[model samples]
Target: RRGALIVLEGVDRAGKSTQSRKLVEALCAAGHRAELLRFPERSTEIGKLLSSYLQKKSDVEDHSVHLLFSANRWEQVPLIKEKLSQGVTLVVDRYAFSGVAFTGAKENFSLDWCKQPDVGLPKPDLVLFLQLQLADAAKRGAFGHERYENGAFQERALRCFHQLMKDTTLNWKMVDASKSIEAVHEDIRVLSEDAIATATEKPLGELWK
Candidate 1:
């Protein structure tokens, strides 16, 4: 049976990385082949450019940056497909949604435009959106280090995310990120197992269609 593609998405400090790691660990402990993959994977050439741009070390045009993010994901398509084809479940920390949300929140950019580049990328079997209030997120440590970590921008991004959720037909599950980490992990595990069970019966889906 093929493995499922599970994506965890949310604003910064919402514990996406933490939860993704825990989910992968739990899945492995349960004898499933699981691995974690984070986006803007900074090792690749395009990823290196994106990392520099993200860290404020250099500036790229907003449109250019958005395209780079999409390219970064595109570069991983082969690897993603190979792993899933081998029945390796992937826990992805952020995906096209983050690309669309962050860039679309910027001035003079539209979500439709933001989504165009990633129109046919591999879609997740489940998208677990970690929902947290911006004010609560601000209380988390190390919140203001990244380029898009500010409250105003995050608010706009959150708005864009909600709109994206409403506009898409993907499987989306909202988890309250304000809860304890263990609680969130339990919820994710349940959702993921269900997705995994069904994924084998259906062919992988393409994004935005």
Candidate 2:
């Protein structure tokens, strides 16, 4: 049986990172093999370019940047498959959803176009969307450090996420990210266990199918 591809996604400061780490820890403590991965992986060649663009050190066209983000994920497909095939559950902090949501939030960019580059990527067994209100998210520390971290853009991105959730094929779970840290972890831990058990019996799925 293979391991589950569990993805956590949300706006900045929504605690996806914190909860992802805790989930991996809890899974490992219970004798499961789990690892954590974050998108725009930032360690790969393409990621280096993304890092510069994200950090305001360099500029790339909107369409080009979107492709670069998608490419970054594509570059990791082999490793992702290898780990899942080896029965190692991957707790991903973000994935294609963020790519589409963020880029699509920009003016004149279509969400459909934003999704094209990631259409065939390995699908997650469970997509837990950490839901947090924009105002609440702004109250968290370090809210405006990245390219798309501003309240106006984040508001648009949040709308994009809501639209993405309308897709019926994806196994999307809405999580209350405003909850306490431990509370969020507990919810994710339970969901991950159930997803792992079910995915173990089924073949892997493709994104946007």
Candidate 3:
């Protein structure tokens, strides 16, 4: 049988990277093999270009950056499928949600436009939304040195995540990241187990139609 896809998402510096590592470790301790994938995947050509823009190493239009991000995911589709078939559960830091959220930050592109190319893409069996206050997120460190890094834009992306959640039919669990690390891990461990367990009992599905 194939492994399940689990997506952990939230604002930057919300302790997401730390929590994700812990969650995967817990899964391994429990005898479940798991892997992790971070977005803006810098390995691919498109990803390198996107990274350049994100890191200010290169300049590109917002639209190109957005599509490149989506293409980054597209580039991994075959390998993601292979890993799943091999029974290695993949935990991703971001997916189509980033596509929707980031591009949604732009005025010219609507959410619908942002979500279009992602149609028929692999969907996570469950998405855990780590909720963090924007102000607190900002205090965590200097904002992502990228163009989209700004209080005003992040506030907008927060709103977009909510709207994007409503618009999609994917099963999701929301975790309050404002809680202590131990507390947050408790919530994540329980929820992550629940998702894998439930998926084992159901038919696999595409992320969204």
Q: Tell me the TM-score of each prediction against the true structure.
A: 0.97, 0.98, 0.94
In order, the Cα lDDT scores of the candidates are 0.92, 0.92, 0.82
- Per residue, candidate 1 scores C-alpha lDDT tens digits across 1-209 of 88899999999889899999999999999999999999989999999999888889999999999999999999999999999999999999999999999998999998889999999999899999999888888888657566997888999999999998995679999998899999989999989998988856788889997
Q: What is the C-alpha lDDT profile of model 2 across 94-203, one tens digit per residue?
A: 99999999998999999888999999999998999998888888888756566887888888999999999999888999999889999988998998999988856878
User: Where is model 1 poorest over a 10-residue stretch in terms of lDDT?
Assistant: 140-149
Compute the lDDT of residue 132 as modeled in candidate 3. 89
Badly placed stretches (over 4 Å) of model 1 are: none
Better of 2 and 3 by lDDT: 2
Model 2 global lDDT (CA atoms, 0 to 1)? 0.92
lDDT of 3 by residue, 1-209 (tens): 67888888887777778888888888889999888887868888888888778888888988877888888888898988888788888888878887788789778789888887778777788888999889988888777677778988888888888987885678778999999998999898888887777774555566557
By how many angstroms RMSD does model 3 differ from the true structure? 1.5
Q: Number of clashes in every candidate structure?
A: 0, 0, 1
